[PDB]
Amino acid sequence: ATVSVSLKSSTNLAFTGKPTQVSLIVRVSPTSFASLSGIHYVVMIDNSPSMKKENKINLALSSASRLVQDIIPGNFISIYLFSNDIETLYEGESGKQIELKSIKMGYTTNLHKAITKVLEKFKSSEIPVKIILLSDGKPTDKRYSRDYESLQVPKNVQLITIGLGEDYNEAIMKILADKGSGVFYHINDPSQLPTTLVEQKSDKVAAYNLTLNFSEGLEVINYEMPVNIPVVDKDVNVYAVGNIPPGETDYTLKVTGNYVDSVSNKNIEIDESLVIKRAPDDEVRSNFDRTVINEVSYYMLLRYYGNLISEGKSEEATRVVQELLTAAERTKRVELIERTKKLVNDPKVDLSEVTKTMRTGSIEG
Amino acid sequence: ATVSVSLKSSTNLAFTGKPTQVSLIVRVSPTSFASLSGIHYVVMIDNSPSMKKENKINLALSSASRLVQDIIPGNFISIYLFSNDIETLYEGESGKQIELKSIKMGYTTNLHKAITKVLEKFKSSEIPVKIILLSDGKPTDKRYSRDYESLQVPKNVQLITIGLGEDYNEAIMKILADKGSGVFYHINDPSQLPTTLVEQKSDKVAAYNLTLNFSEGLEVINYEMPVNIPVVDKDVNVYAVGNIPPGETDYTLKVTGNYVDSVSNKNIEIDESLVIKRAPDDEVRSNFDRTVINEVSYYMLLRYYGNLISEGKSEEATRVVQELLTAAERTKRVELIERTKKLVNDPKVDLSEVTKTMRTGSIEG
Ligand SMILES: [Cl-]
Ligand SMILES: [Cl-]
Ligand SMILES: [Cl-]
Ligand SMILES: [Cl-]
Ligand code: NA
Ligand code: NA
Structure with missing residues (x-):
């Protein structure tokens, strides 16, 4: 295999009498490379x-x-x-x-x-x-x-x-x-x-024609769905937020797809899943990983910001910039803090930086 | 106008330190008619x-x-x-x-x-x-x-x-x-x-070429997005679930689009919105309308059920049927209870009934 696909969820549990929010981070990490x-x-x-x-x-x-x-x-x-x-x-x-x-x-x-x-x-x-x-x-x-x-x-x-x-x-x-x-x-x-x-x-590249399909109710924030990328040559980071239906049945979140291994030329299946189980409300509440929620929230805020800027809503956009800063610092992630500070309320600069921050795996330097 | 588009939300408020779930019911009600x-x-x-x-x-x-x-x-x-x-x-x-x-x-x-x-x-x-x-x-x-x-x-x-x-x-x-x-x-x-x-x-018809566009973060459960229906001749009911980003800014949920009025032949704009404001956590929690959440949850469960049946997962599907019954009774809605009881675990019958229950406005009798 030339990539490794990882799933990180904000929860392993869901409420039984109401829907549950879930924040998911999926990463495609290249692990070996071949000539393009x-x-x-x-x-x-x-x-x-x-x-x-x-x-x-x-x-x-x-x-x-x-x-x-x-x-x-x-x-x-x-x-x-x-x-x-x-x-x-x-x-x-x-x-x-x-x-x-x-x-x-x-x-x-x-x-x-x-x-x-x-x-x-x-x-x-x-x-x-x-x-x-x-x-x-x-x-x-x-x-x-x-x-x-x-x-x-x-x-x-x-x-x-x-x-x-x-x-x-x-x-x-x-x-x-x-x-x-x-x-x-x-x-x-x-x-x-x-x-x-x-x-x-x-x-040098790790994979071609990578597709990631997400199970029902999951919305990817930073890429169009289904996530499809013809060339993987660095980490691909995918952030999603979704909603799980109520009840007592186990609910499996799935990320499935395929890619072409750049070394062997073989077409390889992707199948990653997480089973969400049910628990009493206080146990569900206590189990949420707020670090995952906060990181995904940053990208929700960034999407919002991009739309404000594209709509010319300049004061509200500057207010959201302040919040993005707060949200990025809340993550304690450094790339992210520096990227956020590049948002200077010049809309050409800002919309370009939004795409760069959303899809770092698509940047070529 | 030959239709009226209404919005009903589970919340007027959102949390400030984390994302907020929102359940939305949008209805397009014909109010006058003309010959097709x-x-x-x-x-x-x-x-x-x-x-x-x-x-x-x-x-x-x-x-x-x-x-x-x-x-x-x-x-x-x-x-x-x-x-x-x-x-x-x-x-x-x-x-x-x-x-x-x-x-x-x-x-x-x-x-x-x-x-x-x-x-x-x-x-x-x-x-x-x-x-x-x-x-x-x-x-x-x-x-x-x-x-x-x-x-x-x-x-x-x-x-x-x-x-x-x-x-x-x-x-x-x-x-x-x-x-x-x-x-x-x-x-x-x-x-x-x-x-x-x-x-x-x-x-007799009320509208042609109806489109409903939903603002960011809102996922329609029962129709493909953007919602687009060439002929409106009875109520169109749309159920969505979404997630609102954190922070202190007001957040406007929007349903926008257009349709052709069947009486005048004029092309009419749709613009319905709800401003979500911020409040302390306990106030946000106390403001949720659980009847809206429950009704939308039914359709989340029904979507899940449809997928189980299409995947041949028959025991789990029967378990979800039991939950759909519970969920439908929880709504106290009668059409819905009767529709749910038509799910008989014959997959041809069941998948057909799923489409009928999801899109009643598309049924012709
Ligand atoms: Cl040459
Ligand atoms: Cl609480
Ligand atoms: Cl004739
Ligand atoms: Cl509580
Ligand atoms: Na400029
Ligand atoms: Na049959």
């Missing part, structure tokens, strides 16, 4: 007129060419430009030296059309796919984040977004990252673009 | 060799012809047969006298292919659609209910299933009904088929 093989990267680059400004398009294309070069052989990569429609600059093996040159295209930024078309290419595909989408401006087709809530991201596709400068729609870049279980990188300055893009490569 | 207009019925009829037996196909087709006749003018209806593939017998206006004759087709029952193809016809469509699917046998393409969990039912499509006899896969007929916010009718005997099919018509 058989996956497909897609880089989608805005080719609107704004990107022509100040060599942005050139910075983006030279960086895309580097990524093509640097991804180890044995994988596949497509490079698309989009404006009015999508155009293919390269589709072929990784590890090649190629010159990507810009081409003339139409006006407009039909982002929804572009991402829809690319997602459709991978419907029902077994190939692990990472899509990286870069833009410096607002879409002109579907202009609001709510327009993207219906997007259907196929199994085994991840979507990562990079927003450049101050003029793009961060709510849209966030929801895309959320729907695709990726990260939304805000980068104020084009000087950071090459590193952000080239760092998206992975040389 | 502008919708599209689809009847899909299994045309495998088993259906040729004992005039089943003939009973089904004569009944489909009656439904074509009886649906009032101003609507549209498609009649498909499926086995190896789908074939169209009729596509046209309602209110017509047509003879539907069987035709020779291939062997096999490619149910997943058939439903996929029909659903695709209505991707991105604004037309309210009711699909009624009849079968007397097991699919031969995708043979397990888990194979249907990924089905994408478009907005404004409802899927109703009718299982005939003892040889079809009830778990599949159930999941299809669940994914399409419909009802799964088990009918042991072909003599009941004509009534079950013809009764699917509605003469």
Whole structure:
């Protein structure tokens, strides 16, 4: 096995006369690694007129060419430009030296059309796919984040977004990252673009096409459900909150799924469970692990905060930031405290940091 | 307005140092009606060799012809047969006298292919659609209910299933009904088929294309989310359980959406909300409305029961039946007690009754 999937629950017991709240932390920990093989990267680059400004398009294309070069052989990569429609600059093996040159295209930024078309290419595909989408401006087709809530991201596709400068729609870049279980990188300055893009490569991986299905009544907070991640190259941390029905029957919480072992190439089953038993009320109350509840609450608060910021509710958002700080300190977790302090009420920065904190396993550095 | 949307919560308050459970009942009550207009019925009829037996196909087709006749003018209806593939017998206006004759087709029952193809016809469509699917046998393409969990039912499509006899896969007929916010009718005997099919018509309706979106952290138990129902002709009852994050900020639960008023044809916004405030723990505890919690718990238990039955876990299922009885009596609700007593541990009967009890607003009589 190349990963270990662990379950940590706030309770082993449930009330008998009313529903019981449960907080769950699931971690997928890579335990051994192999060279990346058989996956497909897609880089989608805005080719609107704004990107022509100040060599942005050139910075983006030279960086895309580097990524093509640097991804180890044995994988596949497509490079698309989009404006009015999508155009293919390269589709072929990784590890090649190629010159990507810009081409003339139409006006407009039909982002929804572009991402829809690319997602459709991978419907029902077994190939692990990472899509990286870069833009410096607002879409002109579907202009609001709510327009993207219906997007259907196929199994085994991840979507990562990079927003450049101050003029793009961060709510849209966030929801895309959320729907695709990726990260939304805000980068104020084009000087950071090459590193952000080239760092998206992975040389070593533990698992492909990981799926985690949760039993009924359990709601994952930080990833779309079912949890599906095409490439596991570092810890994947999943936080959920749920509700257990009353009565006297034992109730089994289940996390089930599968993944492809990167060393053997075998498809391995995931089956982790916890049996919740029943007890008198005072015994149930005394058994709750408040440290688990507090850690999960942080992510509930963070989700709320992300939504406030995306909705422009700035004062309430700052109040919640104060609470996130309190909640993070309550956990005594250090990564988390530092991450929380990066929330500076700049909505581009904040929504990007929300995705990074929610899905650390999706970050590439 | 032709409907009234009401919210009933188990709490007005939330704890400040930990998450709070909330049970919510949302009802959409029709308040005035108009003649059904502008919708599209689809009847899909299994045309495998088993259906040729004992005039089943003939009973089904004569009944489909009656439904074509009886649906009032101003609507549209498609009649498909499926086995190896789908074939169209009729596509046209309602209110017509047509003879539907069987035709020779291939062997096999490619149910997943058939439903996929029909659903695709209505991707991105604004037309309210009711699909009624009849079968007397097991699919031969995708043979397990888990194979249907990924089905994408478009907005404004409802899927109703009718299982005939003892040889079809009830778990599949159930999941299809669940994914399409419909009802799964088990009918042991072909003599009941004509009534079950013809009764699917509605003469009078209050709303079309109703959508209910729930704010973060709220999980609807008895319908797929977002809740979307193409035709409202009787009360729609929605039960949800959720979890509120800690802290001191007011937290607004929201049910938002829209529908088309059947009298004016205008598209009307739904916006219902409840502000949850904070209080000391003892005050929060004292404020919970246990009658709301108990009623929602019934549906949590019923969902669990449905899953046990679909998984063949028969002893545990009978234990849960006993608890459902207790839970239903705890509510003192009469419809509910009688419905619970119809659960007889025959899995075809039981899974059908689960869908009927979950979605009474989807039942047609
Ligand atoms: Cl080369
Ligand atoms: Cl207490
Ligand atoms: Cl006629
Ligand atoms: Cl107490
Ligand atoms: Na900014
Ligand atoms: Na039976």
